[PDB]
């Protein structure tokens, strides 16, 4: 029957909720209460990247950290040299409604997608020397929300069709499909090993996925609204999430329940983007109020504010070296903060 | 190596020259979002003017307009609709005759009420607050047939219609009955009540009694986009 399965699911939900409560011996705040607070953090705008004609939706830093790809709704994908502000490549897009972009670890290829429902792969190192779309991945039935390359031949994506899907670029076919989420998947973040990935959807739930298996190992709840952003802590054992409820929460994998909650009575706007500093001590969050808040991840204190955008901050990225933070806004500008 | 630095500088200038041309073509084009239910008549309106998102390119007196229809997207629009916050205007198509309980139209007891809810959610969205709406009250030909026949009464699903009186600006069509005029004007007044409540001058609503085969639909959109651009230039000068 449907009721017996429903009460059985409720039984399992309460059993999980008791098992997780049995591990809540001490809060992360109590454990970190005795360490020195970070104090005021002051970051200046070193580089302002100009050239996009419409709102920026996404940006990804290259592994070298000297370069970054930005994605805008004017139909253009732009590659920038952050050390000189020089544009390395401007890629015209077939569909103007791009919502995501990704840089490969090698840096040989980049990826973009959006309302077209397609993840398009562009080669940046052609024999002719001209950037050309090299593969179009068409399986997804809803918009592309996020993408990340595991390597040059593999890339994971998330769609508004409620699902995620590993792709083999050479074949163009989905090796495996992740369909656990019930709402539009908004974001995903690969673990440093790349064995696992986390995903945030519009169901106020985050899912941990085994890439090779294609199975959801853990589900994490407690957000009041849609999860817009997600990022793994740099050790791979925890991750942070940003929601429309104007709150950020840090969720531990081994503990299977959120260690910390970052909120403030004055913040009543949703979060668009979250990133961690190289140590993981600082959590950076982009907001709909046009400002990024720097949080002390261990103590949940607002260390600093980045305030240079005139429109909603759409995306944030910290360099691989940890030297810089990039911010992209609906104001058409990307700002690099030190 | 100065050779790498001068090459990157030249590459940047070649890109900037191409981006200047792109800016002229992007800023000269007017972007439209067409929203409608399956039985609104948006598809027929699109067919007359004439992919996870469908695009139609049409021109009106030297002016290029790019129109976007959803296509393959789920029925949840809270995330995807935020992408259309820069369009010139949102052409919302509503079937006027869908006030009664019809199994064929989405199996919905009231499609007009669902259209009213959608319009109120779009008009009051924080991201769409500055975006003007061109309301297309489509299927007026069917509405006249249903109101003249009289089997299904609007007052059953819209009790206020019993006290409704057609206003002095009725401008009825040649040979139109008073009953059709009171009906369509009540339909238009339902949407105007939502738009008048929160517009605040940031965005404007342009209602139009439309039919799926009307040749005037393209000229109405041209005129609405011209009035929208005029008000946006007036606002910059503070003339309002």
């Amino acid at each position: 029957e449907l009721d017996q399965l429903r009460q059985e699911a409720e039984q399992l939900k309460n059993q999980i909720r008791d098992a997780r409560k049995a591990c809540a011996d001490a809060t992360l705040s109590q454990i970190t209460n005795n360490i020195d607070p970070v104090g005021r953090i002051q970051m200046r705008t070193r580089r302002t990247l100009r050239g996009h004609l419409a709102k920026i939706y996404a940006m990804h830093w290259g592994t070298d950290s000297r370069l970054l790809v930005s994605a805008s709704q004017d139909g253009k994908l732009i590659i920038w040299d952050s050390y000189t502000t020089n544009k390395v490549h401007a890629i015209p897009l077939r569909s103007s409604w791009v919502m995501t972009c990704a840089y490969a670890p090698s840096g040989n290829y980049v990826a973009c997608g959006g309302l077209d429902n397609i993840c398009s792969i562009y080669n940046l190192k052609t024999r002719e020397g001209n950037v050309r779309v090299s593969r179009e991945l068409a399986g997804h039935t809803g918009y592309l929300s996020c993408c990340r390359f595991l390597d040059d031949n593999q890339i994971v994506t998330s769609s508004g069709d409620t699902t995620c899907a590993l792709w083999d670029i050479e074949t163009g076919q989905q090796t495996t499909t992740f369909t656990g989420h019930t709402g539009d998947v908004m974001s995903l973040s690969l673990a440093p090993d790349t064995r696992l990935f986390v995903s945030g959807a519009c169901d106020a739930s985050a899912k941990l996925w085994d890439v090779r298996e294609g199975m959801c190992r853990q589900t994490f709840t407690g957000h009041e609204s849609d999860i817009n952003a997600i990022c793994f802590f740099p050790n791979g054992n925890a991750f942070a999430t940003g929601s429309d409820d104007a709150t950020c929460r840090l969720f531990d994998l081994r503990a299977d329940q959120e260690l910390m909650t970052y909120s403030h009575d004055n913040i009543i706007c949703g979060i668009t983007s979250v990133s961690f500093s190289k140590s993981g001590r600082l959590l950076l969050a982009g907001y709909d109020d046009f400002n990024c808040n720097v949080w002390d991840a261990l103590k949940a204190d607002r260390a600093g504010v980045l305030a240079g955008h005139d429109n909603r901050v759409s995306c944030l990225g910290v360099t691989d070296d940890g030297m810089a933070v990039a911010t992209g806004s609906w104001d058409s500008f990307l700002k690099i903060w030190n | 190596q100065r050779n790498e630095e001068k090459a990157q500088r030249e590459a940047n200038k070649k890109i900037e020259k191409q981006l200047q041309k792109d800016k002229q073509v992007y800023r000269a084009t007017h972007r439209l979002l067409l929203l409608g239910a399956g039985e609104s008549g948006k598809n027929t309106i699109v067919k007359q003017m004439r992919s996870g998102i469908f695009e139609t390119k049409f021109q009106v007196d030297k002016v290029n307009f790019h129109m976007f229809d959803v296509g393959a997207q789920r029925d949840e629009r809270r995330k995807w609709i935020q992408c259309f916050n820069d369009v010139t205007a949102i052409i919302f198509v509503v079937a006027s005759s869908s006030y009664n309980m019809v199994i064929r139209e989405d199996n919905q007891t009231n499609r007009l009420q669902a259209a009213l809810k959608l319009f109120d959610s779009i008009w009051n969205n924080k991201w769409l607050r500055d975006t003007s709406v061109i309301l297309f009250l489509n299927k007026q030909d069917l509405l006249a047939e249903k109101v003249l026949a009289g089997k299904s009464k609007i007052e059953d699903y819209f009790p206020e219609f019993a006290r409704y009186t057609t206003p002095e600006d009725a401008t009825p069509e040649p040979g139109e009955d008073p009953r059709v005029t009171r009906a369509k004007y009540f339909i238009r007044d339902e949407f105007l009540r939502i738009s008048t409540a929160s517009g605040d001058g940031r965005h404007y609503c342009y209602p139009h009694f439309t039919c799926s085969v009307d040749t005037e639909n393209i000229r109405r959109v041209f005129n609405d986009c011209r009035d929208i651009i005029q008000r946006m230039h007036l606002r910059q000068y503070e003339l309002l």
Partner: nanobody
Amino acid sequence: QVQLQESGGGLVQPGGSLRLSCAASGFTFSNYKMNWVRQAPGKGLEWVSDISQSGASISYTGSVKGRFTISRDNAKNTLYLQMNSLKPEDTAVYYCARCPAPFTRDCFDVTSTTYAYRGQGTQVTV
């Protein structure tokens, strides 16, 4: 975890009266506009009523106006629908539905199939 559980639905005679209750947990109830939606058999989900966060702004569908009352208690985290003068057309599964985001004037997707922030529903028969 966001949870909405409806109750109070059952079989009534034509002209009878029911009172549906929705208990809410896992979110700040006061920050969200609440809605009652219904799915009649063989038909799609239809919006019935909405209440603002304070309870000051209230709307109803035309078919149920003057027969249905929507109320919310912020302290109890409870949403209520009082249905009077019930008719056979009012036979449906009733689902209390929260608006997606808090503090927002707009409310989108509450009547959409597979909406996350919606309870399992309570069937009402006349």
